Design a protein around this motif. Structure first.
Motif, PDB file in Angstrom:
ATOM      1  N   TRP A 156       0.261   6.228  -0.263  1.00  0.00           N
ATOM      2  CA  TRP A 156      -0.497   7.281   0.400  1.00  0.00           C
ATOM      3  C   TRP A 156      -1.961   7.269  -0.011  1.00  0.00           C
ATOM      4  N   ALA A 157      -2.278   6.851  -1.248  1.00  0.00           N
ATOM      5  CA  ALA A 157      -3.677   6.691  -1.639  1.00  0.00           C
ATOM      6  C   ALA A 157      -4.377   5.668  -0.757  1.00  0.00           C
ATOM      7  N   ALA A 158      -3.713   4.535  -0.513  1.00  0.00           N
ATOM      8  CA  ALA A 158      -4.264   3.525   0.378  1.00  0.00           C
ATOM      9  C   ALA A 158      -4.433   4.067   1.790  1.00  0.00           C
ATOM     10  N   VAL A 159      -3.378   4.681   2.340  1.00  0.00           N
ATOM     11  CA  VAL A 159      -3.474   5.270   3.673  1.00  0.00           C
ATOM     12  C   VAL A 159      -4.622   6.257   3.740  1.00  0.00           C
ATOM     13  N   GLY A 160      -4.761   7.103   2.707  1.00  0.00           N
ATOM     14  CA  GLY A 160      -5.799   8.120   2.716  1.00  0.00           C
ATOM     15  C   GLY A 160      -7.203   7.572   2.580  1.00  0.00           C
ATOM     16  N   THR A 161      -7.385   6.517   1.784  1.00  0.00           N
ATOM     17  CA  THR A 161      -8.682   5.860   1.695  1.00  0.00           C
ATOM     18  C   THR A 161      -9.061   5.202   3.010  1.00  0.00           C
ATOM     19  N   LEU A 216      -2.144  -1.162  -0.652  1.00  0.00           N
ATOM     20  CA  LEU A 216      -1.106  -0.877   0.321  1.00  0.00           C
ATOM     21  C   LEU A 216       0.008  -1.903   0.233  1.00  0.00           C
ATOM     22  N   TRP A 217      -0.347  -3.182   0.141  1.00  0.00           N
ATOM     23  CA  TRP A 217       0.669  -4.220   0.069  1.00  0.00           C
ATOM     24  C   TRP A 217       1.297  -4.356  -1.315  1.00  0.00           C
ATOM     25  N   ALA A 218       0.646  -3.851  -2.365  1.00  0.00           N
ATOM     26  CA  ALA A 218       1.300  -3.757  -3.666  1.00  0.00           C
ATOM     27  C   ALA A 218       2.335  -2.643  -3.708  1.00  0.00           C
ATOM     28  N   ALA A 219       2.092  -1.549  -2.984  1.00  0.00           N
ATOM     29  CA  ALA A 219       3.090  -0.498  -2.863  1.00  0.00           C
ATOM     30  C   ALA A 219       4.269  -0.944  -2.013  1.00  0.00           C
ATOM     31  N   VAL A 220       4.008  -1.655  -0.909  1.00  0.00           N
ATOM     32  CA  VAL A 220       5.099  -2.119  -0.063  1.00  0.00           C
ATOM     33  C   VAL A 220       5.916  -3.197  -0.755  1.00  0.00           C
ATOM     34  N   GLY A 221       5.267  -4.036  -1.579  1.00  0.00           N
ATOM     35  CA  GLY A 221       5.985  -5.068  -2.296  1.00  0.00           C
ATOM     36  C   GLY A 221       6.760  -4.568  -3.494  1.00  0.00           C
ATOM     37  N   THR A 222       6.262  -3.527  -4.165  1.00  0.00           N
ATOM     38  CA  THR A 222       7.036  -2.903  -5.231  1.00  0.00           C
ATOM     39  C   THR A 222       8.301  -2.258  -4.687  1.00  0.00           C
ATOM     40  N   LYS A 223       8.209  -1.622  -3.509  1.00  0.00           N
ATOM     41  CA  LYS A 223       9.407  -1.114  -2.852  1.00  0.00           C
ATOM     42  C   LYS A 223      10.353  -2.245  -2.462  1.00  0.00           C
ATOM     43  N   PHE A 224       9.815  -3.377  -1.991  1.00  0.00           N
ATOM     44  CA  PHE A 224      10.642  -4.542  -1.670  1.00  0.00           C
ATOM     45  C   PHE A 224      11.299  -5.128  -2.911  1.00  0.00           C
ATOM     46  N   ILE A 225      10.594  -5.112  -4.049  1.00  0.00           N
ATOM     47  CA  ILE A 225      11.150  -5.647  -5.282  1.00  0.00           C
ATOM     48  C   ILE A 225      12.293  -4.781  -5.787  1.00  0.00           C
ATOM     49  N   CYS A 226      12.154  -3.459  -5.661  1.00  0.00           N
ATOM     50  CA  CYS A 226      13.206  -2.554  -6.115  1.00  0.00           C
ATOM     51  C   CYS A 226      14.417  -2.572  -5.193  1.00  0.00           C
ATOM     52  N   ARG A 227      14.206  -2.774  -3.889  1.00  0.00           N
ATOM     53  CA  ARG A 227      15.331  -2.877  -2.966  1.00  0.00           C
ATOM     54  C   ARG A 227      16.100  -4.177  -3.167  1.00  0.00           C
ATOM     55  N   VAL A 228      15.386  -5.274  -3.453  1.00  0.00           N
ATOM     56  CA  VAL A 228      16.034  -6.562  -3.677  1.00  0.00           C
ATOM     57  C   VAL A 228      16.913  -6.518  -4.920  1.00  0.00           C
ATOM     58  N   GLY A 273      -3.414   3.038  11.042  1.00  0.00           N
ATOM     59  CA  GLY A 273      -2.963   3.419   9.723  1.00  0.00           C
ATOM     60  C   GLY A 273      -1.477   3.281   9.469  1.00  0.00           C
ATOM     61  N   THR A 274      -0.713   2.820  10.451  1.00  0.00           N
ATOM     62  CA  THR A 274       0.729   2.655  10.352  1.00  0.00           C
ATOM     63  C   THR A 274       1.086   1.243   9.875  1.00  0.00           C
ATOM     64  N   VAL A 275       2.297   1.108   9.328  1.00  0.00           N
ATOM     65  CA  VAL A 275       2.831  -0.164   8.837  1.00  0.00           C
ATOM     66  C   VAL A 275       4.138  -0.455   9.562  1.00  0.00           C
ATOM     67  N   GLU A 276       4.301  -1.700  10.025  1.00  0.00           N
ATOM     68  CA  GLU A 276       5.475  -2.136  10.779  1.00  0.00           C
ATOM     69  C   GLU A 276       6.129  -3.312  10.059  1.00  0.00           C
ATOM     70  N   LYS A 277       7.425  -3.547  10.336  1.00  0.00           N
ATOM     71  CA  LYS A 277       8.189  -4.603   9.678  1.00  0.00           C
ATOM     72  C   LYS A 277       8.990  -5.410  10.698  1.00  0.00           C
ATOM     73  N   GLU A 278       9.105  -6.712  10.441  1.00  0.00           N
ATOM     74  CA  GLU A 278       9.864  -7.642  11.278  1.00  0.00           C
ATOM     75  C   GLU A 278      10.836  -8.412  10.384  1.00  0.00           C
ATOM     76  N   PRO A 279      12.109  -8.008  10.310  1.00  0.00           N
ATOM     77  CA  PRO A 279      12.896  -7.243  11.295  1.00  0.00           C
ATOM     78  C   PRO A 279      12.713  -5.734  11.270  1.00  0.00           C
ATOM     79  N   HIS A 280      12.730  -5.092  12.434  1.00  0.00           N
ATOM     80  CA  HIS A 280      12.656  -3.640  12.474  1.00  0.00           C
ATOM     81  C   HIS A 280      13.934  -3.042  11.907  1.00  0.00           C
ATOM     82  N   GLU A 281      13.784  -1.980  11.105  1.00  0.00           N
ATOM     83  CA  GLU A 281      14.932  -1.273  10.549  1.00  0.00           C
ATOM     84  C   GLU A 281      14.864   0.236  10.785  1.00  0.00           C
ATOM     85  N   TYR A 282      13.859   0.910  10.229  1.00  0.00           N
ATOM     86  CA  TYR A 282      13.770   2.367  10.276  1.00  0.00           C
ATOM     87  C   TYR A 282      12.823   2.834  11.382  1.00  0.00           C
ATOM     88  N   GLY A 283      13.154   3.976  11.990  1.00  0.00           N
ATOM     89  CA  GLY A 283      12.294   4.584  12.994  1.00  0.00           C
ATOM     90  C   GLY A 283      12.610   4.162  14.414  1.00  0.00           C
TER      91      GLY A 283
END
Ligand SMILES: *OP(=O)(O)OC[C@H]1O[C@@H](n2cnc3c(N)ncnc32)[C@H](O)[C@@H]1O
Ligand SMILES: *OP(=O)(O)OC[C@H]1O[C@@H](n2cnc3c(N)ncnc32)[C@H](O)[C@@H]1O
Ligand SMILES: [Mg+2]
Lengths: 218, 5, 208, 4
Positions: free
Chosen positions: C172-177, A178-190, A207-217
């Motif tokens: 989504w794989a992580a969320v689903g697991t 989960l954190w490798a997916a969130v960090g790959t997105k952070f790497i591409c945005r940077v 099962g939700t993910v939150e960010k500080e600073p809040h941006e989306y949602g």
């Protein structure tokens, strides 16, 4: 913009561990073919519960084995291994590291931050440090675009933020994925918009993910 | 700040 | 252990993008007894969002994934089914009726009604997981019945209703697991639709 | 509508 496209950038990843290996794989699958992987440690059986590699790489250097895996993902994959710790001792190795455009630290080690700040990169680089909290309940995500790494500010930001599926429990494969997916997105945005950035993500029990600073949602 | 990668 | 997936036999119908990654996640947390049901071959275009590499292109998706899963941990005991669901042999149907948790990762409405038409001859924990076309969301349905509730699952999917990259599918794989592990720990009728934002944050809306 |  093509000049802000990570798929055309050389991307060093210092640390071929749990998070680093999964990020390196993510980046290779999106098209980042020119990757450097730096790690002196060997893979062991206890690492396999939270890693991209399998038992076939146990006993091999973590960087060399990760580079073997990465070069099997795409026909034009050009991953290169550095089976040593940062900084290297050889001058040739240092010059090789100074050819990479984006330097991504995935070690979780404060000494590596201090070494990054002390190394003579000889040009402006896009630095990106990424590490998780001890039970993978959160993710520290720092970035900077300077000729020298800002260790003090990064440390300040980290300190300011500071079943088994529940985030409080020890880290599992899915937590690191989960954190490798969130960090790959952070790497591409940077890389798309270089600059001084800092964000702190949090896994929640529902099962939700939150960010500080809040941006989306909401 | 303890960090695990 | 009755609430622990590591001791449960887990069939995963669909060894594609989401199902390959989910299977690997489960193997690494300790779900050693796994089945993998897929009839199609792995393609080069699949690799952009898959758990396997070029060394498996041209091989059946189930067999290749099982070879990979059995190399993850010493006690891994994955088994491949190179046919489409339902099987034709009566031996094969009995083999699938040994699994405790049947996890559909095909995104095919035909598989949903095939699950309902199959006779599982015992209560199972059924979990259907699929994504939207650009991986902006994840449909996550679960049930604990002797027959898959196809009508209700379809209803909840229809009510909730760039190209997906490796970081979109891995998230989504992580969320689903994590959803799969919450369901086996507390079985029941559960439905949850997740949504990914541009910065990787995730929001949820469960059905009441 | 759904893609696995
Ligand atoms: O598994 P993990 O989360 O501990 O991952 C950490 C990885 O980082 C590597 N590491 C540690 N220190 C260095 C330096 N100086 N250079 C390159 N890699 C480094 C660990 O070996 C581990 O794989
Ligand atoms: O790539 P993708 O997101 O479409 O993944 C879907 C996977 O599901 C498999 N599939 C489709 N239909 C079936 C049946 N009936 N049985 C087993 N697997 C099935 C696709 O082959 C793909 O791997
Ligand atoms: Mg070790």
């Amino acid at each position: 913009e093509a000049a802000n496209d990570i798929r055309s950038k050389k991307v060093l990843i210092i640390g071929a561990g749990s998070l680093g290996s999964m990020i390196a794989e993510n980046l290779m699958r999106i098209g980042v073919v020119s990757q450097g992987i730096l790690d002196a440690d060997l893979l062991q059986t206890g690492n396999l519960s939270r890693h991209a590699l399998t038992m076939t790489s146990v006993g091999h250097n973590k960087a060399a084995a990760l580079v073997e895996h990465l070069n099997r993902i795409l026909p034009d994959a050009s991953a290169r291994s550095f089976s040593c710790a940062f900084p290297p001792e050889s001058e040739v190795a240092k010059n090789s590291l100074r050819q990479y455009d984006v330097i991504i630290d995935c070690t979780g080690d404060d000494g590596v931050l201090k070494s990054l700040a002390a190394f003579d990169w000889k040009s402006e680089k896009i630095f990106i440090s990424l590490a998780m909290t001890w039970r993978a309940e959160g993710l520290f995500a720092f970035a900077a675009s300077e000729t020298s790494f800002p260790v003090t500010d990064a440390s300040s930001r980290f300190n300011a933020s500071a079943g088994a599926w529940h985030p409080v429990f020890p880290a599992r494969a899915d937590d690191v994925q989960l954190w490798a997916a969130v960090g790959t997105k952070f790497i591409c945005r940077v890389v798309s918009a270089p600059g001084r950035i800092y964000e702190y993500f949090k896994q929640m029990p529902d099962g939700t993910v939150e960010k500080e600073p809040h941006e989306y949602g909401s | 700040t303890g960090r695990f990668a």
